[PDB]
Design a protein around this ligand. Structure first.
Ligand SMILES: Cc1cccc2c(=O)[nH]c(CSc3nc(N)n[nH]3)nc12
Length: 177
């Protein structure tokens, strides 16, 4: 469960890609730093699920880059386990938002004692998805089951994942009001 945290410089293209995406809905916030999380075992397991999904859902673009706001205390945990079973209404899973505004909410990305906020820019294997419900602990059956559940199938603003390795916390955005 080892990992490396690499901080990106603004001068950086990778920084500008993650930043501009964040700034579509959260430009009013001040970005302090953006870090790339490198956890090799979690990345390999995520790519093993991606290779399985790609050779199953045909023409479907299984991967989406979504946002996840969390308290500063959960950061070490996500860095090593991902969006684990001991970490996790439309279901009893882990929620990922299309736009950063949902994740930039103080109830999710709880400002710490220094008033810093935490949002992950996650690689999520959304695959084939349907509408969700409150009683879901796992995704519902098709007639096998779907990969994720969403609030609105044709105009989604969030996705809920249920199994591990379905999401990779690629970047971590540390910002303040
Ligand atoms: C429920 C929901 C909807 C939309 C976005 C989000 C989001 O960004 N983050 C979270 C995480 S709240 C949390 N769980 C644990 N274990 N620690 N903290 N939930 C969301």
């Amino acid at each position: 469960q080892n990992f490396c945290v690499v901080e990106l410089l603004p001068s950086d293209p990778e920084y500008n890609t993650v930043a501009s995406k964040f700034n579509q809905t959260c430009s009013h916030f001040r970005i302090e730093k953006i870090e790339r999380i490198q956890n090799p075992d979690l990345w390999n397991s995520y790519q093993a699920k991606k290779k399985t999904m790609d050779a199953k859902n045909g023409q479907t673009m299984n991967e989406k880059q979504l946002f996840h706001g969390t308290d500063a205390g959960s950061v070490p945990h996500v860095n090593r386990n991902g969006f684990n079973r001991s970490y996790a209404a439309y279901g009893k899973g882990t929620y990922f938002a299309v736009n950063a505004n949902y994740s930039a909410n103080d109830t999710y990305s709880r400002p710490d004692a220094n008033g810093r906020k935490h949002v992950y820019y996650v690689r999520v294997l959304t695959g084939i998805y349907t509408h969700g419900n409150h009683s879901l602990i796992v995704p519902p059956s098709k007639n096998d089951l779907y990969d994720t559940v969403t609030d609105n199938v044709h105009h989604p603003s969030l996705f809920v994942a249920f199994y591990d390795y379905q999401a990779y916390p690629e970047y971590l955005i540390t910002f303040r009001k």
